[PDB]
Amino acid sequence: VAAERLEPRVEEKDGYWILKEQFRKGINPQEKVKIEKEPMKLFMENGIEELAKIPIEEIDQSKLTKDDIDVRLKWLGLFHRRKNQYGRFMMRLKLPNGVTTSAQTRYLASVIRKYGKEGCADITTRQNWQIRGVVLPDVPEILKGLAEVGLTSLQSGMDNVRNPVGNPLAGIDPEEIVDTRPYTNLLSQFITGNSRGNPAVSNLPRKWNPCVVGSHDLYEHPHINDLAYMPATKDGRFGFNLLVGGFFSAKRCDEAIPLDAWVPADDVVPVCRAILEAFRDLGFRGNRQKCRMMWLIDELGVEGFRAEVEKRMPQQQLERASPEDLVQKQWERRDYLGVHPQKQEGYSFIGLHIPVGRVQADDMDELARLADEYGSGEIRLTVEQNIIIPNIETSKIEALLKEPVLSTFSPDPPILMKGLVACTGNQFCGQAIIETKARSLKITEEVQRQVSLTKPVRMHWTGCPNTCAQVQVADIGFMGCLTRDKNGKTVEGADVFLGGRIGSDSHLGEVYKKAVPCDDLVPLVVDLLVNNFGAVPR
C-alpha cells in the first residue's frame, strides 16, 4: 500500500472537519450533503431555531432544507419518518450503558404524551431510548428539556459514533469483571463534547458502534462492534484488549478482529480518538455499502490500520495485545429477568420483560414510579429491549411482585418472550419490508401455546436487510421479505436464519430457508424447536 494512500483526506476548518478539495471526486450523495452544509451547525450554531419555524411543505420545496430535515437532523438525533409517518420525527438519545433516571423517564413520557396516537417509545438493540411523534416546531423546546434533565440526543444517527453499550449489570453483579459505566460515560462525553457537540468525530465515512465489556456473559456483544474493549490484565496492569471492525449490513456481516493492541484503563478515550481519527482521515467515501471501518481494515490490512492508530496515540505508543483476557470462556449466559441479589448486601435488582421493547407514556410513568418507590430512581435498558430496576431493598421484593403493572411487564414471562427481540419495522420505518413488532408477538405467543421448552432460545425479528435486530446473532432469526402464497398473491414473509451464537463462543447465523410466508411460520418454528432445541408438544 502506497504512502499516498495514508494522506489524511479531511481537514479542520473553522471548528468543523471537511473533505479536502482533492478528495471530493466520486463521493456518495451523503458526503455531498455534508459538504453542502455542516450538519453540526444545526445544534452548535443553533441553526435549528430558524429551521423549525419553516412549515414542512415549504421545507420540502428546496434541496438544502429537505436535506436538513431528512439527513442533517440525524446529527441531532432526529429521524424524519417521511414515508410512514410524514412530518413526524423519531428522536434517539445517547444513553451510555443503558442507564436512565425516573426524572428522565417522566420527561420522555411527557413529550410523547403530547402526540397522542402518534406518540410512543421504544427500547433499542443498543440499550437506548427512542421517542416518537415529534413535530419540527417543538424541536427547540425538546432539546432544551432534554438538556435540563441531563440527556442528549447528539450524534446518534448517520455518520456518527452510536450509543456506547456496556454491561447492564454494571456495578451490581457479584460476578462482574469491571464496572463499565465510568468507561461508557467517558466515551459518550468524548463523542458528544460533553453534550455541546464534537465535530472532530461527527464527519466519519459511516456509522461506528462501540462497546465496553464488563461481563463474562458478554452481554455487550463485542463481536459485532466497530470497537470492543475486552478487559485484560497485561504485565500486572488492568486494561483492555481491542477488537475492531465488527459490523452488520445488507451486503456483508463480519465479526470484530483483534487489533493486536492493549491499552491501560486510562487510555480508553485516547485510543477511541485515535481509531476514529484514522477512520475519519482515511476511510473510503464512495459506495455507502463499502464505507464501514472493516473495509478500511481490509484495504490497509490490520497491521497497516494498527500503524495508523499508533501514530495517533499520545507519544505514539500502542502496546500489543495481552496473551489472555479476563473473560472466562467457561460460562453460561445468565438470565437477568426476575429478582437477583446484588453484590451490595441486602439489595436486589429486578429484570422486567418489555414486550418487543414498546411502551406508551402511561407505562413509562409507571416504570418511573416503581424505580422511585422500590429502587433508587434508576431504570436500566438492555439490548434485548428489556429493563432492569436496580438497588431495591430485598425486603421490598414481596410487595413489588404484587404490583399490577408486573402483570404486563413481567419478571418471569414465558421463555420464548425472554429472548424475543424485534426492530421497529414498517409501523414507522420507511426501509421496512414487513411489520415486525406486532407480528413477532403474535407468532411467538402461538408457538409457545403449542410447545414447552427449557433451552433459552433467542428469536430476533428484523424488517429489512439492514438487520438492526441482529438476526445473525439469533438462534432463530426472521428477516422481512415479500413472498407469495399458494395462489401467487403477494404476502409478507421472512427469510429464516439459524446458527447464531453469542457469548465467548460466538458465531454468525445464516439463511436456512428463504421466503416463508409469515402466515406459515408457526408450524415451521414449532418443528424447529422440537427438532433442534428440545421442545415438547403440549
Task: Specify binding-site residues.
Answer: 81, 124-126, 128, 130, 132, 206-207, 209, 248, 289, 292, 385, 423-424, 429, 464, 468, 470
> Judged by CB, which is closer to ligand SF4: 382, or 462?
462
Residue nearer to K ion on the CB measure, 295 or 336: 336
Q: Is 429 in the site for ligand SF4 (CB under 6 A)?
A: yes
Residue 466, interface with ligand SF4 (CB under 6 A)? yes
For residue 103, the minimal CB distance to ligand SF4 (Å) is: 28
Distance CA 220, CA 383 (A): 8
C-alpha to C-alpha distance for 452 and 105, rounded to whole angstroms: 36
163 makes contact, choosing from Cl ion, ligand SF4, ligand SRM, none, with CB < 5 to 8 Å by partner type, with ligand SRM
Chain centroid to Cα 447, Å, comes to 28
Candidate residues 71, 268, 432, 473; the one interacting with ligand SF4 per rule CB under 6 A? 432
d(CA 20, CA 30): 16
Among Cl ion, ligand SF4, ligand SRM, none, residue 41 binds (CB under 5-8 Å by kind): none
Helices first, then strands: H and E counts in the chain: 16, 23
Q: How far apart are CA 228 and CA 167, in angstroms?
A: 12
Tell me: does residue 463 bind ligand SF4 (CB under 6 A): yes
CB closer to ligand SRM, 349 vs 428: 428
428 binds, among ligand SF4, ligand SRM, Cl ion, none (CB under 5 to 8 A by kind): ligand SRM
424 binding ligand SF4? (CB under 6 A): yes
Interaction between residue 154 and Cl ion (CB under 5 A): no
Q: Kindly provide the residue ranges of all beta strands, DSSP E only, lying in 22-145, ordered along the sequence.
A: 78-80, 88-92, 99-101, 121-123, 129-135
The yes or no reply on residue 153 touching ligand SRM (CB under 6 A) is: no
CB distance 347 to 341 below 8 Å: yes
Contact segment (CB under 5 A) with K ion among 164-172, 232-240, 377-385, 450-458 equals 377-385
- 126 makes contact, choosing from Cl ion, ligand SF4, ligand SRM, none, with CB < 5 to 8 Å by partner type, with ligand SRM
Using the structure block, give the residue that is written with the C-alpha cell 460476578. 175
Interaction mask 63-102, Cl ion, x per CB under 5 A: -------------------xx-------------------
Cβ–Cβ under 8 Å, residues 153 and 146? yes
Does the protein bind Cl ion through residue 157 (CB under 5 A)?
yes
In one-letter notation, the amino acid at residue 522 is V
Q: Which of 214, 355, 425, 500 binds ligand SF4 (CB under 6 A)?
A: 425
Query: For 364, phi and psi rounded to 5 degrees?
Result: -60, -45
* Cα angle for residues 240, 336, 258 (degrees, 5° grid): 25
Single-letter amino acid, residue 304 = G
DSSP letter for each residue of 13-32? ETTEEEE-GGG-TT--HHHH
Is residue 48 within the footprint of Cl ion (CB under 5 A)?
no
Residue of 97, 342, 385, 483 that binds K ion (CB under 5 A)? 385
Q: CB of 468: closest distance to ligand SRM in angstroms? A: 3
467 near ligand SRM, judged by CB under 6 A = yes
Q: Is 157 in the site for ligand SF4 (CB under 6 A)?
A: no
327-366: which residues touch K ion (CB under 5 A)?
A: 354
82, interface contact from ligand SF4, Cl ion, ligand SRM, none, CB < 5-8 Å by kind: Cl ion
> What's the rounded Cα separation, in Å, for the pair 436 and 492?
10
Grid cell digits, residue 382? 438492555
105, 386, 410, 440: which one binds K ion (CB under 5 A): 386
For the chain, state the CA radius of gyration. Answer: 23
- How far is the C-alpha of 530 from the C-alpha of 266, rounded, in Å? 49
Query: Helix 521-532 to helix 437-450 angle, to the nearest 10 degrees?
Result: 50
Residue closer to ligand SRM by CB (options 101, 470) is 470
Rounded to 5 degrees, φ, ψ at 485 are -80, -175
CB atoms within 10 A of CB 333: 15
CB of 106 to ligand SF4, least distance (A): 26
Which residue from 468, 476, 521, 528 is in contact with ligand SRM, where contact means CB under 6 A? 468
CA 246 – CA 265 distance, rounded (Å): 22
Closest approach of ligand SF4 to the CB of residue 79, in Å:
10
Q: Which residues contact 406 (CB under 8 A, 6 or more apart)?
A: 352, 400
For residue 183, the partner it binds in K ion, ligand SF4, ligand SRM, none, with Cβ less than 5 to 8 A by kind, is none
Which DSSP letter does residue 96 get? Answer: G
Binding residues for [4Fe-4S] cluster: 423, 429, 464, 468
Minimal distance, residue 184 CB to ligand SRM, in Å: 13
Q: How far is the CB of 532 from K ion (least distance, A)?
A: 23
Q: How many residues bind ligand SF4 (CB under 6 A)?
A: 13
- Mark out the alpha helices in 301-436 (DSSP H runs): 302-310, 361-374, 397-400, 415-418
**218 touches ligand SRM by CB under 6 A:** no
C-alpha grid cell, residue 175: 460476578
Q: Nearest 5 degrees, angle CA 197-CA 424-CA 515?
A: 135
468 is in the binding site of which of K ion, ligand SF4, Cl ion, none (Cβ under 5 to 8 A by kind)? ligand SF4
Do residues 349 and 392 make contact, with C-beta atoms less than 8 angstroms apart? yes
Question: How many CB atoms sit inside 10 A of residue 280's CB?
Answer: 20
Which option in ligand SRM, ligand SF4, Cl ion, none does residue 462 bind, with CB closer than 5 to 8 A by kind? ligand SF4
Q: Please calculate the CA angle 103-108-113 and round it to the nearest 5 degrees.
A: 120
Q: What residues make contact with Cl ion under the rule CB under 5 A?
A: 82-83, 157-158, 430
Q: What residues make contact with K ion under the rule CB under 5 A?
A: 354, 385-386
Q: What residues make contact with ligand SF4 under the rule CB under 6 A?
A: 423-425, 429, 431-432, 462-464, 466-469
Q: What residues make contact with ligand SRM under the rule CB under 6 A?
A: 79, 90, 92, 122, 124-126, 128, 130, 156-157, 162-163, 207, 209, 224, 247-250, 292, 423-424, 428-431, 466-468, 470
